[PDB]
Design a binder for this molecule. Sequence first.
Ligand SMILES: CCc1onc(C)c1-c1cc(F)cc(C(=O)NC[C@@H](N)C(=O)O)c1
Ligand SMILES: N[C@@H](CCC(=O)O)C(=O)O
Lengths: 275, 275
Amino acid sequence: TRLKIVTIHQEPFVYVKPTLSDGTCKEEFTVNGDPVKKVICTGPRHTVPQCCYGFCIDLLIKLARTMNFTYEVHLVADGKFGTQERVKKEWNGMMGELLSGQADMIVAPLTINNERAQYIEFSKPFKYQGLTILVKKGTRITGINDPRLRNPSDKFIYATVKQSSVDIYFRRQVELSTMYRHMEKHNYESAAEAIQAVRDNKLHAFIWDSAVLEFEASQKCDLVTTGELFFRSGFGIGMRKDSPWKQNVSLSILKSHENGFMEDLDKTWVRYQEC
Amino acid sequence: DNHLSIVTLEEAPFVIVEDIDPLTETCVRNTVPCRKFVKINNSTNEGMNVKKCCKGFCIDILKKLSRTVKFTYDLYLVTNGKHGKKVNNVWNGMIGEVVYQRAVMAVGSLTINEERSEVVDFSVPFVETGISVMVSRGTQVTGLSDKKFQRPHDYSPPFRFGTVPNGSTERNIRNNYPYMHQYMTRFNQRGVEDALVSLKTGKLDAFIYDAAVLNYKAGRDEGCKLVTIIFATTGYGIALQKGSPWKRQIDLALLQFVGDGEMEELETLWLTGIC
Ligand SMILES: CCc1onc(C)c1-c1cc(F)cc(C(=O)NC[C@@H](N)C(=O)O)c1
Ligand SMILES: N[C@@H](CCC(=O)O)C(=O)O
């Protein structure tokens, strides 16, 4: 055993914080007096120890305790989810890390889709969500079909995160060729930068995972989401096709939905009442 | 071995069974042939296959899989139970048909849970579901987890609520809420139609059941009287025999349909509501 876990920064699934001066994590408590569990995670390729927690970290702990394994967590070196790019073709991001042997499992809000499943094994979904659009509170939009996205210009800017499944979908889809030409000039490196950019009117609309965006909107009152969910899909744990863990990882996730544990994680990390 | 025995079960709008044009014994276009074994009497194993015609959301999925993954099939309706229940350690229903190798796969409104995954392989989920509660509009309950369900006799009068036994909903309530389970058995309903009538006529206060079916029914409700207020999110999947060689391509095809828009078309075709 000793599984190498790759993950990525993405609140509220994985928070990433400095260790204190001794090498430990700040003792922290939920409302209710319950201890926030934290793990040491290495990340940037000059690596330093850091502190990780959130929904995905609690899931990993649950998984490690259930199936009886030990692990080391690192943040993905390039900061990316993973797409297959021309060099003849190669995966970057967490996908690349898993396929090369840098990681043995991806534990992250990693979307389950056809192209990734051709190369890796996904668990049953630990979370169900889709895509939506985050704007600054002033803005009224229909959604992904509103004219300001459909007929773009410099007078309303929209973007997604690079080396995401959403980015390379916009690149490959014929009817999206004009929206991509606009997004090409504005796409960001990380969801957090993009979210900040919207707060400051440097970005008018950010297309991203509803689980993340609705969370943002629940916490910050100067943000809102709009449109219906589209491309409803799941997040899954990622493993190589010959991982011997794949059956029991999937069984554990099913058990955790059925017994209330996942709803527990949602009450702790995802369902906030600041707005 | 391209010609597959496949079992299904009637449950609108996922699978709808109609009588065959009695002159022609030919299934009208848009429907596929399905057989049902019908006993001659109750004192005998003797019976005859009746030719019927099958359509619906799941049927359309089957037709798409058949073309993409390149198999032909002989579809039949399960007669030994319904979706699947373990009785004295023996599986009945569609799950049983797969476990004991009378079918290569099971297609329909078949919920993925842990105990069934122990004995069958499941595809990726292709319809999102779980456990919901249907009530007459105005009824105030927070969800499955409310104390009106968990401790019914704390209240005067006690809420009247029930499910259709022997499926995934009842299995889940049995494992998680023992007092709720035993109280509910008094109000259990033979099927969904019985349940909706009980609700509409004041004989039942709530009906707990599969979320996909309840949402559909709510959306088609005359007057929009019946509403739903999802616990244990999961989905419907194709069940296959453990270690099935068809699983790889079926999973890929299902994920392709999500990313192609073909799934969205089927949803509109079959599951749209007014309310
Ligand atoms: C069937 C899934 C699918 O197919 N085509 C597209 C586009 C999507 C899709 C849906 C979704 F809800 C989130 C993401 C995503 O890329 N999110 C970002 C990140 N979680 C990632 O995994 O890259 C991608
Ligand atoms: N879809 C359920 C049946 C209905 C229910 O019990 O909610 C199953 O596959 O058992």
